[PDB]
From Swiss-Prot:
The protein's role, per its UniProt record: Hydrolyzes the second messenger cAMP, which is a key regulator of many important physiological processes. May be involved in mediating central nervous system effects of therapeutic agents ranging from antidepressants to antiasthmatic and anti-inflammatory agents.
Residues that hold Mn(2+) according to the record: 124
Residues binding 3',5'-cyclic AMP: 83, 292, 295
Positions bearing Phosphoserine: 336, 338
Residues that hold Zn(2+) 1 according to the record: 87, 123-124, 241
Span of the entire protein shown here: 324 to 680 of 736
Tissue specificity annotation: Expressed in brain, heart, lung and skeletal muscle. Expressed in white blood cells.
Name the record gives this protein: 3',5'-cyclic-AMP phosphodiesterase 4B
Family: Belongs to the cyclic nucleotide phosphodiesterase family. PDE4 subfamily.
Active site: 83
Residues noted as binding Zn(2+) 2 in the record, renumbered to the chain: 124
Species the sequence originates in: Homo sapiens (Human)
Residue numbers binding AMP: 83, 87, 124, 241, 292, 295
Annotated S-S bridges: none
Residues noted as binding Mg(2+) in the record, renumbered to the chain: 124
Length: 351
């Protein structure tokens, strides 16, 4: 209901224009946030669920859905530069687009589609704007609870599911016990997979799958067993999570400005607490351009190249944009002279 969003007819008309790109890679989620009183995750998720008739299929009332989504979205930190609800909204919408790629047509069940989009929506909830290592190094209660392993990722999941218990928030109330068990299994799998420390293993497994790749007479992929389906889904969400460099430059630049701002803020916290500054977190040493080029060359491109292979020729335009964006950043490198976590990777592979 538009009233729950507090949007007037004028901005509702603006949103109607923006949402024409709901099923497109070119959707501008920044504009959606601007016309929805900064509730891009709830707005885009509502639009997605309506578009896919998910509310109908799973007997989720608009009331329960919006209440839960607004609750979830409010648990993202609006003062965190990158890992906020705008990023979650972007990953959710990007996942929604990837799910409809021709090569995957009719491959996934409605429960798997629900699980993937839900996973994308909650994958960074209650993110503090600092890395797992920062939490571990400060002897954070969170790190102690999760034994220093995928600390934030485990937390995002715990929060995402815990919020279903708040008043009028159980969007899975009408799923069968079996469906809830299966969806929960898949969501946990996908969110845990967003831990950048698992990237290399994910890509390797994905490549191994592309080898045994099977298609139909029309070209559609064939995934008849659960293990292969969840493997594609976990990589799909991971790709959506790493899709910023594949969007139009106007968007990509904003995403980059944001992640750097977030890294710099962690750097400020480290300096404030007498800690050594983490890689990429010192604005007076960080090479933004070099870092993006290196990150694309060693992490993003390899991943998307593999995904494109799996769904060829579906993701060709994405690869072209990624290439153009990479070369733009390489050109922007101030005319100069001659680990296993995002921050460490960006510093290591720095071009
Ligand atoms: As909306
Ligand atoms: As991320
Ligand atoms: As990252
Ligand atoms: Mg994350
Ligand atoms: Zn993310």
């Amino acid at each position: 209901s538009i009233s729950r969003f507090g949007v007037n007819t004028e901005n509702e008309d603006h949103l109607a224009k923006e949402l024409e790109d709901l099923n497109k890679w070119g959707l501008n989620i920044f504009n959606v946030a601007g016309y929805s009183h900064n509730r891009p995750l709830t707005c885009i998720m509502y639009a997605i669920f309506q578009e896919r008739d998910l509310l109908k299929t799973f007997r989720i009332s608009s009331d329960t859905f919006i209440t839960y989504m607004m609750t979830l979205e409010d648990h993202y930190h609006s003062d965190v530069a990158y890992h906020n609800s705008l990023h979650a909204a972007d990953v959710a919408q990007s996942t929604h687009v990837l799910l409809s790629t021709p090569a995957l047509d009719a491959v996934f069940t409605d429960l798997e589609i629900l699980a993937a989009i839900f996973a994308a929506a909650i994958h960074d909830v209650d993110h503090p704007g600092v890395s797992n290592q920062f939490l571990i190094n400060t002897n954070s209660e969170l790190a102690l609870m999760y034994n220093d392993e995928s600390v934030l990722e485990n937390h995002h999941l715990a929060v995402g599911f815990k919020l279903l218990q708040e008043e009028h928030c159980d969007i899975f109330m009408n799923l069968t016990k079996k469906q809830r068990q299966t969806l929960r299994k898949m969501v946990i799998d996908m969110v845990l997979a967003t831990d950048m420390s698992k990237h290399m293993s994910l890509l390797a497994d994905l490549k191994t799958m592309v080898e045994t790749k099977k298609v139909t007479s029309s070209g559609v992929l064939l995934l008849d067993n659960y293990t292969d389906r969840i493997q594609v889904l976990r990589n799909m969400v991971h790709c959506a999570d790493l899709s910023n460099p594949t969007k139009s430059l106007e968007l990509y630049r904003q995403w980059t400005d944001r992640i750097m701002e977030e890294f710099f803020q962690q750097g400020d916290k480290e300096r404030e607490r007498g800690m050594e500054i983490s890689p990429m977190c010192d604005k007076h040493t960080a090479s933004v351009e070099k870092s993006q080029v290196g990150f694309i060359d060693y992490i993003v491109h390899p991943l998307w190249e593999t995904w494109a292979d799996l769904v060829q020729p579906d993701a060709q335009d994405i690869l072209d944009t990624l290439e153009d964006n990479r070369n733009w950043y390489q050109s922007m490198i101030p005319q100069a002279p001659a680990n296993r976590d995002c921050q460490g990777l960006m510093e290591k592979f720095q071009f």
